[PDB]
Amino acid sequence: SSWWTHVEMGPPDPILGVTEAFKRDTNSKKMNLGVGAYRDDNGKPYVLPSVRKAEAQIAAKNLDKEYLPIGGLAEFCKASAELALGENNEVLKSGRFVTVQTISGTGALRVGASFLQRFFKFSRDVFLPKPSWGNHTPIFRDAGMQLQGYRYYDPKTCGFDFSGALEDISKIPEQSVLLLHACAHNPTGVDPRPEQWKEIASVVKKKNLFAFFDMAYQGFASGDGDKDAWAVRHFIEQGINVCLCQSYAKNMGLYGERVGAFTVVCKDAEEAKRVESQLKILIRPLYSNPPLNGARIAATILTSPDLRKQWLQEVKGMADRIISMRTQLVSNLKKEGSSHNWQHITDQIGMFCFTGLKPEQVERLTKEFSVYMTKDGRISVAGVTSGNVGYLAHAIHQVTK
Amino acid sequence: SSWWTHVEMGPPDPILGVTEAFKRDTNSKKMNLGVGAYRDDNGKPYVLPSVRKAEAQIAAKNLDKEYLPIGGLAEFCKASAELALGENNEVLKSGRFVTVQTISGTGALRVGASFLQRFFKFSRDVFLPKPSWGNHTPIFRDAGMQLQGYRYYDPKTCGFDFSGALEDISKIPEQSVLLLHACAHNPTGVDPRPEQWKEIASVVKKKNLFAFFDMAYQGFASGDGDKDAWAVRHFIEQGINVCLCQSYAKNMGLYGERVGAFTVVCKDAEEAKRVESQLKILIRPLYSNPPLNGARIAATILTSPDLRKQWLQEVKGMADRIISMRTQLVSNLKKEGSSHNWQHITDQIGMFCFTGLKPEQVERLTKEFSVYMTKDGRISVAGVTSGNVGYLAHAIHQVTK
């Protein structure tokens, strides 16, 4: 007597649970360290002025709203590949890549997954770091791939378990897919060092693996676009034919406009044309064609030397404000008398920090102090202000003294 | 070798072929009847003045670009359901529905299809009219459903094969899914009349079929949104709990902004809460959350009485331009001395029209007249103007007399 009587209610959203638990809390000193987007020194959302200026120029052009090609705005695709690999990359010069516009980084992930499902005949397995972005798991499963793990986060140190990572990678059957965060690993903030990368690169090429890069933070991570894109470029120069998911949600503040690109580096231009045609064939039955607004903004910024330069410094200020909060947190933890090693909070990169806090300590931070955060010890460094970091260092010490 | 040596070049897009060949032609009398979007009486893109006003007003509010919920803009969702169902539908008053924002119409079809695949345990079969929108097949297929057909187009009359349709549907296995175009069937332009819809409804309800409405053209079809949604409303009024895909591509000319919605009509609000949570769970691994810009524009128009009233005159405008083209096309065929019955051109509805022309006649139209269209005889009425309709009728009469 109904189509949907057996449809069950989903598990609740832990990250949304906390974000609502915070709005309810009435104490004026409450912090939300669960928020998944950049906030300014006052905890407000931040629309980059280069973005505002791009919108101004765009509006002036009085443009139409006609469909994009299936692969999106050609000029955004070219600029985006350029941002990822550097303008004079051997790959761009010979044309041996295809880049399609996607529905932010998630859509690039899903389009990427769907492409492996269909054309990566060698294996069903996708190896994620332990842990990874939560959504990585259902994206690859819903798309029809098998998930696996390799060691990454060393809880003992709150940094990279280089050696476990490496043993694990050497043991991946050949021609399996390996997923890598290009920088600012999410949720932990723990990234390999350049020398560590070269070694993963070595095994990957040795053991004949497929390197799938997720790059959500180029520039936002360290302030330096080239540094943040270094591992990806290094794999390519090593002769590894990567694919790559870019997001402009964070580094341009374009979250809700859903601006992303998926790229596949190929042996040659003719191969890229074959791959391109099949990405179009997968994309059409997902959503036909991608949205105009974000991509017009990002294209306008990237292809204007002035605006590009200005945006690039606006990114540095975001990256910096975050770094500042990391350094200032450790500072005030010392200044408060704490004894344990907090260098991991500043060794980590990007806006997510695995603190080391265990769950009970997390719960006491919520109860006694109104500091909201996931039981895994992850905080949004974007929730920290200069105005509140002091209080936070006090509170963290209390549950940990 | 390479990861991708076995990846085949995909087949050429035929609609894009027609459109590119049209663009190469240097014949000054050329016509593009392959175009997949509205054009004005000079053959130009048309941004509704209400859309410009809505945009201006949004810009004036200096809004953020933060992430929408997985289900999109709450107020766009509400207004979208009210548009489809009529503001005082008992479905709205009891709250027995869920509506989520999607990546336009295509996105609503894909989300619905994944939901069927995962939850509609009663069937793997989706019945499409013959013919149907080409993308319907890969949509449901990539989502893991199977496709079947029922007789719809009647090639003898270029009309609706009512008795064939009614018979076929009356023999669909109970509890299969039945896809129906709400109005302005694409590609034929052939619609059932109200009385015919009552009979279909009565057979769906007899056989316990699940009705899946694609509604890409409310208001755009006839200029009257209440009449265009009548079938959908009638089905619901008869106790059929439909799902529904909406697009704002054509009726608001938001094509490239990708604004659509998927609705499930449910037994009660409680069931709608359950269905909602599982639509969310399927949306996340697709694209996380939908684009903001078009949804803001649509919510703004729908919830302001002045903008809504203006928008409704603009839709009527487009619909009447299309009806006008249809009428003058038949009229001029008669002035040319054609003796074929051409009333199908005026009986059909919307911007796509099955002319009745054979492939060879289509070839002659392309070669000798530079009139560009697909070989199935389909023309896009949007490419017809006051300027060229006389010419079109002359060409059609030349190749058919």
Ligand SMILES: Cc1ncc(COP(=O)(O)O)c(CN)c1O
């Ligand atoms: C590693 C990673 N990959 C993918 C995403 C998804 O980004 P987007 O919002 O552009 O889909 C994010 C941002 N949450 C991320 O941090």
Ligand SMILES: O=C([O-])CC(=O)C(=O)O
């Ligand atoms: O490009 C699209 O979304 C499809 C379309 O209008 C058609 O050809 O009928």
